[PDB]
Write an enzyme that holds these catalytic residues in place. Structure first.
Site, PDB file in Angstrom:
ATOM      1  N   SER A 140       0.828  -1.198   0.000  1.00 13.31           N
ATOM      2  CA  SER A 140       0.000   0.000   0.000  1.00 13.31           C
ATOM      3  C   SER A 140       0.869   1.257   0.000  1.00 13.31           C
ATOM      4  N   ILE A 167       3.629 -10.436  -8.682  1.00 11.53           N
ATOM      5  CA  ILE A 167       3.592  -9.819 -10.006  1.00 11.53           C
ATOM      6  C   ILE A 167       2.901 -10.708 -11.045  1.00 11.53           C
ATOM      7  N   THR A 168       1.728 -10.275 -11.496  1.00 12.51           N
ATOM      8  CA  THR A 168       0.971 -11.028 -12.486  1.00 12.51           C
ATOM      9  C   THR A 168       1.729 -11.157 -13.809  1.00 12.51           C
ATOM     10  N   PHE A 241       1.400   5.441 -11.036  1.00 12.10           N
ATOM     11  CA  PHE A 241       0.075   5.842 -10.570  1.00 12.10           C
ATOM     12  C   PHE A 241      -0.837   6.230 -11.727  1.00 12.10           C
ATOM     13  N   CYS A 243      -0.664   4.812 -14.679  1.00 11.08           N
ATOM     14  CA  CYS A 243      -0.999   3.554 -15.321  1.00 11.08           C
ATOM     15  C   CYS A 243      -2.039   2.847 -14.458  1.00 11.08           C
ATOM     16  N   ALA A 247      -5.775   1.075 -15.181  1.00 12.03           N
ATOM     17  CA  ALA A 247      -6.069  -0.306 -14.818  1.00 12.03           C
ATOM     18  C   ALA A 247      -7.264  -0.412 -13.878  1.00 12.03           C
ATOM     19  N   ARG A 248      -7.311   0.467 -12.883  1.00 11.64           N
ATOM     20  CA  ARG A 248      -8.400   0.459 -11.920  1.00 11.64           C
ATOM     21  C   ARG A 248      -9.737   0.663 -12.626  1.00 11.64           C
ATOM     22  N   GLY A 344     -26.283 -23.620  -2.020  1.00 12.06           N
ATOM     23  CA  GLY A 344     -26.089 -24.620  -0.980  1.00 12.06           C
ATOM     24  C   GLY A 344     -24.826 -25.456  -1.131  1.00 12.06           C
ATOM     25  N   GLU A 368      -4.335  -3.171  -6.668  1.00 13.30           N
ATOM     26  CA  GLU A 368      -4.640  -1.894  -7.305  1.00 13.30           C
ATOM     27  C   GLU A 368      -5.187  -0.968  -6.234  1.00 13.30           C
TER      28      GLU A 368
HETATM   29  C1  LIG Z   1      -0.901   6.894  -3.675  1.00 13.84           C
HETATM   30  C2  LIG Z   1      -0.520   6.008  -2.434  1.00 13.84           C
HETATM   31  C3  LIG Z   1       0.796   5.270  -2.630  1.00 13.84           C
HETATM   32  C4  LIG Z   1      -0.340   7.074  -1.260  1.00 13.84           C
HETATM   33  O1  LIG Z   1       1.081   7.570  -1.198  1.00 13.84           O
HETATM   34  P1  LIG Z   1       1.422   9.160  -1.158  1.00 13.84           P
HETATM   35  O2  LIG Z   1       2.883   9.459  -1.110  1.00 13.84           O
HETATM   36  O3  LIG Z   1       0.800   9.877   0.044  1.00 13.84           O
HETATM   37  O4  LIG Z   1       0.708   9.519  -2.503  1.00 13.84           O
HETATM   38  P2  LIG Z   1       0.702  10.988  -2.999  1.00 13.84           P
HETATM   39  O5  LIG Z   1       0.258  11.937  -1.971  1.00 13.84           O
HETATM   40  O6  LIG Z   1      -0.071  10.864  -4.278  1.00 13.84           O
HETATM   41  O7  LIG Z   1       2.223  11.338  -3.283  1.00 13.84           O
HETATM   42  C5  LIG Z   1       2.946  10.606  -4.245  1.00 13.84           C
HETATM   43  C6  LIG Z   1       3.002  10.960  -5.810  1.00 13.84           C
HETATM   44  O8  LIG Z   1       1.942  10.390  -6.667  1.00 13.84           O
HETATM   45  C7  LIG Z   1       1.250  11.423  -7.508  1.00 13.84           C
HETATM   46  N1  LIG Z   1      -0.014  10.950  -8.097  1.00 13.84           N
HETATM   47  C8  LIG Z   1      -1.166  10.481  -7.465  1.00 13.84           C
HETATM   48  N2  LIG Z   1      -2.136  10.123  -8.274  1.00 13.84           N
HETATM   49  C9  LIG Z   1      -1.614  10.363  -9.543  1.00 13.84           C
HETATM   50  C10 LIG Z   1      -2.115  10.202 -10.954  1.00 13.84           C
HETATM   51  N3  LIG Z   1      -3.314   9.735 -11.234  1.00 13.84           N
HETATM   52  N4  LIG Z   1      -1.273  10.563 -12.001  1.00 13.84           N
HETATM   53  C11 LIG Z   1      -0.030  11.048 -11.741  1.00 13.84           C
HETATM   54  N5  LIG Z   1       0.537  11.235 -10.508  1.00 13.84           N
HETATM   55  C12 LIG Z   1      -0.310  10.873  -9.455  1.00 13.84           C
HETATM   56  C13 LIG Z   1       1.410  12.541  -6.463  1.00 13.84           C
HETATM   57  O9  LIG Z   1       0.875  13.835  -6.863  1.00 13.84           O
HETATM   58  C14 LIG Z   1       2.897  12.572  -6.153  1.00 13.84           C
HETATM   59  O10 LIG Z   1       3.673  12.775  -7.348  1.00 13.84           O
HETATM   60  P3  LIG Z   1       4.354  14.184  -7.813  1.00 13.84           P
HETATM   61  O11 LIG Z   1       3.287  15.235  -8.023  1.00 13.84           O
HETATM   62  O12 LIG Z   1       5.074  13.930  -9.129  1.00 13.84           O
HETATM   63  O13 LIG Z   1       5.294  14.682  -6.754  1.00 13.84           O
HETATM   64  C15 LIG Z   1      -1.650   4.995  -2.127  1.00 13.84           C
HETATM   65  O14 LIG Z   1      -2.911   5.708  -1.955  1.00 13.84           O
HETATM   66  C16 LIG Z   1      -1.867   3.861  -3.288  1.00 13.84           C
HETATM   67  O15 LIG Z   1      -2.154   4.125  -4.486  1.00 13.84           O
HETATM   68  N6  LIG Z   1      -1.703   2.553  -2.803  1.00 13.84           N
HETATM   69  C17 LIG Z   1      -1.863   1.408  -3.654  1.00 13.84           C
HETATM   70  C18 LIG Z   1      -0.678   0.625  -4.017  1.00 13.84           C
HETATM   71  C19 LIG Z   1      -0.700   0.345  -5.495  1.00 13.84           C
HETATM   72  O16 LIG Z   1      -0.435   1.258  -6.272  1.00 13.84           O
HETATM   73  N7  LIG Z   1      -1.019  -0.960  -5.883  1.00 13.84           N
HETATM   74  C20 LIG Z   1      -1.052  -1.316  -7.305  1.00 13.84           C
HETATM   75  C21 LIG Z   1       0.072  -2.025  -7.848  1.00 13.84           C
HETATM   76  S1  LIG Z   1      -0.291  -2.813  -9.359  1.00 13.84           S
HETATM   77  C22 LIG Z   1      -1.438  -4.078  -9.190  1.00 13.84           C
HETATM   78  O17 LIG Z   1      -1.908  -4.368  -8.160  1.00 13.84           O
HETATM   79  C23 LIG Z   1      -1.772  -4.827 -10.426  1.00 13.84           C
HETATM   80  S2  LIG Z   1      -2.882  -6.174 -10.165  1.00 13.84           S
HETATM   81  C24 LIG Z   1      -3.108  -6.956 -11.831  1.00 13.84           C
HETATM   82  C25 LIG Z   1      -4.476  -6.882 -12.550  1.00 13.84           C
HETATM   83  O18 LIG Z   1      -4.901  -6.001 -13.258  1.00 13.84           O
HETATM   84  O19 LIG Z   1      -5.217  -7.975 -12.310  1.00 13.84           O
HETATM   85  C1  LIG Z   2      -3.237 -12.118  -7.642  1.00 15.33           C
HETATM   86  C2  LIG Z   2      -2.464 -10.846  -7.340  1.00 15.33           C
HETATM   87  C3  LIG Z   2      -1.796 -10.226  -8.411  1.00 15.33           C
HETATM   88  C4  LIG Z   2      -1.011  -9.011  -8.234  1.00 15.33           C
HETATM   89  N1  LIG Z   2      -0.365  -8.490  -9.367  1.00 15.33           N
HETATM   90  C5  LIG Z   2       0.414  -7.345  -9.117  1.00 15.33           C
HETATM   91  C6  LIG Z   2       1.132  -6.801 -10.258  1.00 15.33           C
HETATM   92  O1  LIG Z   2       1.118  -7.232 -11.419  1.00 15.33           O
HETATM   93  N2  LIG Z   2       1.934  -5.669  -9.983  1.00 15.33           N
HETATM   94  C7  LIG Z   2       2.104  -5.020  -8.744  1.00 15.33           C
HETATM   95  O2  LIG Z   2       2.841  -4.047  -8.639  1.00 15.33           O
HETATM   96  N3  LIG Z   2       1.401  -5.545  -7.671  1.00 15.33           N
HETATM   97  C8  LIG Z   2       0.598  -6.657  -7.847  1.00 15.33           C
HETATM   98  N4  LIG Z   2      -0.120  -7.230  -6.708  1.00 15.33           N
HETATM   99  C9  LIG Z   2      -0.026  -6.652  -5.367  1.00 15.33           C
HETATM  100  C10 LIG Z   2      -1.100  -5.672  -4.892  1.00 15.33           C
HETATM  101  O3  LIG Z   2      -1.104  -4.539  -5.746  1.00 15.33           O
HETATM  102  C11 LIG Z   2      -0.772  -5.263  -3.446  1.00 15.33           C
HETATM  103  O4  LIG Z   2      -0.848  -6.516  -2.754  1.00 15.33           O
HETATM  104  C12 LIG Z   2      -1.701  -4.274  -2.710  1.00 15.33           C
HETATM  105  O5  LIG Z   2      -1.646  -3.026  -3.377  1.00 15.33           O
HETATM  106  C13 LIG Z   2      -1.223  -4.002  -1.295  1.00 15.33           C
HETATM  107  O6  LIG Z   2      -1.207  -5.126  -0.498  1.00 15.33           O
HETATM  108  P1  LIG Z   2      -0.064  -5.852   0.277  1.00 15.33           P
HETATM  109  O7  LIG Z   2      -0.099  -7.268  -0.091  1.00 15.33           O
HETATM  110  O8  LIG Z   2       1.270  -5.245   0.374  1.00 15.33           O
HETATM  111  O9  LIG Z   2      -0.736  -5.606   1.695  1.00 15.33           O
HETATM  112  P2  LIG Z   2      -0.431  -4.415   2.692  1.00 15.33           P
HETATM  113  O10 LIG Z   2      -0.053  -3.197   1.954  1.00 15.33           O
HETATM  114  O11 LIG Z   2       0.509  -4.963   3.712  1.00 15.33           O
HETATM  115  O12 LIG Z   2      -1.827  -4.107   3.333  1.00 15.33           O
HETATM  116  C14 LIG Z   2      -2.512  -5.040   4.124  1.00 15.33           C
HETATM  117  C15 LIG Z   2      -3.905  -4.650   4.769  1.00 15.33           C
HETATM  118  O13 LIG Z   2      -3.790  -3.491   5.619  1.00 15.33           O
HETATM  119  C16 LIG Z   2      -4.599  -2.282   5.269  1.00 15.33           C
HETATM  120  N5  LIG Z   2      -3.724  -1.106   5.299  1.00 15.33           N
HETATM  121  C17 LIG Z   2      -2.488  -0.901   4.691  1.00 15.33           C
HETATM  122  N6  LIG Z   2      -1.961   0.277   4.911  1.00 15.33           N
HETATM  123  C18 LIG Z   2      -2.891   0.921   5.717  1.00 15.33           C
HETATM  124  C19 LIG Z   2      -2.989   2.266   6.356  1.00 15.33           C
HETATM  125  N7  LIG Z   2      -2.056   3.190   6.231  1.00 15.33           N
HETATM  126  N8  LIG Z   2      -4.123   2.552   7.121  1.00 15.33           N
HETATM  127  C20 LIG Z   2      -5.109   1.618   7.268  1.00 15.33           C
HETATM  128  N9  LIG Z   2      -5.132   0.368   6.738  1.00 15.33           N
HETATM  129  C21 LIG Z   2      -3.988   0.085   5.969  1.00 15.33           C
HETATM  130  C22 LIG Z   2      -5.320  -2.764   3.952  1.00 15.33           C
HETATM  131  O14 LIG Z   2      -6.763  -2.594   4.020  1.00 15.33           O
HETATM  132  C23 LIG Z   2      -4.982  -4.225   3.627  1.00 15.33           C
HETATM  133  O15 LIG Z   2      -6.127  -5.053   3.863  1.00 15.33           O
HETATM  134  C24 LIG Z   2      -0.945  -8.450  -6.878  1.00 15.33           C
HETATM  135  C25 LIG Z   2      -1.656  -9.107  -5.795  1.00 15.33           C
HETATM  136  C26 LIG Z   2      -2.386 -10.251  -5.977  1.00 15.33           C
HETATM  137  C27 LIG Z   2      -3.055 -10.797  -4.693  1.00 15.33           C
END
Ligand SMILES: CC(C)(COP(=O)(O)OP(=O)(O)OC[C@H]1O[C@@H](n2cnc3c(N)ncnc32)[C@H](O)[C@@H]1OP(=O)(O)O)[C@@H](O)C(=O)NCCC(=O)NCCSC(=O)CSCC(=O)O
Ligand SMILES: Cc1cc2nc3c(=O)[nH]c(=O)nc-3n(C[C@H](O)[C@H](O)[C@H](O)COP(=O)(O)OP(=O)(O)OC[C@H]3O[C@@H](n4cnc5c(N)ncnc54)[C@H](O)[C@@H]3O)c2cc1C
Length: 390
Positions: A140, A167-168, A241, A243, A247-248, A344, A368
């Site tokens: 996260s 990583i998918t 972010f 990208c 995706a989201r 069931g 995501e």
């Molecule tokens: C954003 C954050 C990390 C919070 O952190 P933070 O530091 O407080 O964020 P923040 O306060 O946003 O500061 C960090 C930087 O991010 C910028 N930003 C935010 N949204 C943006 C957008 N839409 N476009 C461009 N830039 C964006 C922000 O302004 C700053 O950059 P800069 O202006 O250049 O200085 C958290 O809310 C979050 O997004 N957590 C999720 C983790 C994540 O990204 N997981 C996804 C990984 S990929 C995945 O799961 C693929 S699954 C495969 C499938 O499709 O099945």
């Molecule tokens: C099948 C699968 C495929 C994936 N593919 C990709 C991929 O291709 N690329 C990629 O980059 N990632 C990928 N991921 C990872 C996914 O994006 C991350 O798992 C997710 O964004 C964050 O989870 P984590 O596992 O680190 O859990 P954590 O970040 O450890 O979070 C765990 C729990 O704690 C809570 N939590 C976390 N931080 C806070 C906070 N500050 N305050 C309150 N609650 C909080 C959340 O609700 C969550 O339930 C994949 C995951 C799965 C399961």
């Protein structure tokens, strides 16, 4: 009047192209994917062909203009995802990474040399890519990622060192889009290719969600990335972010396809299954569940449509996407759970699919951005106050 399959007539809200695009892909998903999911999910088998198949249909990176892509609307993108997830979230997951997490960034942050080199092959599915952001210690909080990239002035290359997990597609990937923190505090994107020395992508085992999808790691033991493989339009989290936002959006639409499959299945089952001398659908408790499923699916669908239109107008905002991804994912998770319960005993057999969808949406609700993470992003955008950390 009134069709429970489109109670609020979304059909008359789509262009003729979007409709033709949807039904075309739908025939494919039902013909070429639906029959292979049972065993693919049961034995964790992800046929590589799938990508080739989707590529040659042009569903890969469909909103990109030129470079061999379809150049369609955001709505069309949504419809595609939805039809795929209607089969299985794993599949959609592989297709969403390819499109929004690989091609999009290459196209928007990459150089022209890279756009030319990679875009066509991906669009054709000749190159399976993956997105590496998550690390065992960074989920996260991507800003805490440990993978470092060292710049080598002599040959103007970078030596990346780190580990990306969950990583998918990494296991059978050809191209890798890794994000690493550079020595100046900024984070850039790096294009890695299978074969590079120090690069391994082992497959993760024990998954009970998205099993038909290959998931693995990206372990980089001092991998050297050439000057031409660095992403010119990168600087801090904004890159991945951007990208992610794409995706989201696809997911917000995708899970609706899953919820719909479960409604249909539960509804049909409720009609065919007889208990106490009547079909289950005669019972009030059963009818309220069908009512709730349809209600939420509907709310999500039309909301996603409006986000599609805004996206193409460039009026779409990041927090809009959080709102629907978070909403639709949780709501779809519950729909799958209810359908499971509604069948069931049979509901726990993968032969009735609902269980597979319930298990799959568990992961989708996590990646995501977790459900609570999108709560905090929305909460921050509402109060102006940050509450992710202390
Ligand atoms: C954003 C954050 C990390 C919070 O952190 P933070 O530091 O407080 O964020 P923040 O306060 O946003 O500061 C960090 C930087 O991010 C910028 N930003 C935010 N949204 C943006 C957008 N839409 N476009 C461009 N830039 C964006 C922000 O302004 C700053 O950059 P800069 O202006 O250049 O200085 C958290 O809310 C979050 O997004 N957590 C999720 C983790 C994540 O990204 N997981 C996804 C990984 S990929 C995945 O799961 C693929 S699954 C495969 C499938 O499709 O099945
Ligand atoms: C099948 C699968 C495929 C994936 N593919 C990709 C991929 O291709 N690329 C990629 O980059 N990632 C990928 N991921 C990872 C996914 O994006 C991350 O798992 C997710 O964004 C964050 O989870 P984590 O596992 O680190 O859990 P954590 O970040 O450890 O979070 C765990 C729990 O704690 C809570 N939590 C976390 N931080 C806070 C906070 N500050 N305050 C309150 N609650 C909080 C959340 O609700 C969550 O339930 C994949 C995951 C799965 C399961």
């Amino acid at each position: 009047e009134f069709d429970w399959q489109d109670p609020l007539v979304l059909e008359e809200q789509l262009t003729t192209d979007e409709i033709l695009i949807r039904d075309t892909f739908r025939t494919y998903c039902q013909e070429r994917l639906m029959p292979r999911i049972l065993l693919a999910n049961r034995n964790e088998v992800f046929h590589r062909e799938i990508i080739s198949e989707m590529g040659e249909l042009g569903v890969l990176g469909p909103t990109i203009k030129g470079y061999g892509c379809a150049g369609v609307s955001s709505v069309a993108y949504g419809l595609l995802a939805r039809e795929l997830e209607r089969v299985d979230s794993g599949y959609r997951s592989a297709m969403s990474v390819q499109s929004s997490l690989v091609m999009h960034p290459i196209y928007a942050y990459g150089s022209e040399e890279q756009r030319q080199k990679y875009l066509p092959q991906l669009a054709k599915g000749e190159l399976l890519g993956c997105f590496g952001l998550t690390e065992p210690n960074s989920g996260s909080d991507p800003s805490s990622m440990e993978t470092r990239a060292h710049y080598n002035s002599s040959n103007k290359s970078y030596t990346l060192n780190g580990t990306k997990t969950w990583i998918t597609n990494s296991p059978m990937a050809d191209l890798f889009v890794v994000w690493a923190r550079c020595e100046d505090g900024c984070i850039r994107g790096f294009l890695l290719e299978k074969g590079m020395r120090g690069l391994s992508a082992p497959r993760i085992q024990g998954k009970f969600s998205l099993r038909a999808s290959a998931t693995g790691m990206i372990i980089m033991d001092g991998v050297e990335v050439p000057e031409e493989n660095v992403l010119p339009g990168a600087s801090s989290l904004g890159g991945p972010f951007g990208c992610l936002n794409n995706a989201r959006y696809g997911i917000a639409w995708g899970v609706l396809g899953a919820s719909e499959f479960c409604l249909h299945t539960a509804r049909q089952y409720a009609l065919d299954r007889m208990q106490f001398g009547v079909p289950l659908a005669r019972n009030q408790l059963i009818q309220k569940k069908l009512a709730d499923m349809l209600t939420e699916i509907t709310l999500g669908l039309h909301a996603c449509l409006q986000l599609g239109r805004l996206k193409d107008q460039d009026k779409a905002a990041p927090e809009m996407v959080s709102l629907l991804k978070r909403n639709n994912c949780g709501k779809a998770l519950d729909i799958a759970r209810q359908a499971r319960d509604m069948l069931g005993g049979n509901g726990i057999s993968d032969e009735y699919h609902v269980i597979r969808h319930a298990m799959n949406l568990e992961a989708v609700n996590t990646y995501e951005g977790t459900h609570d993470i999108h709560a905090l992003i929305l909460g921050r955008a509402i109060t102006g106050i940050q509450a992710f950390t202390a």
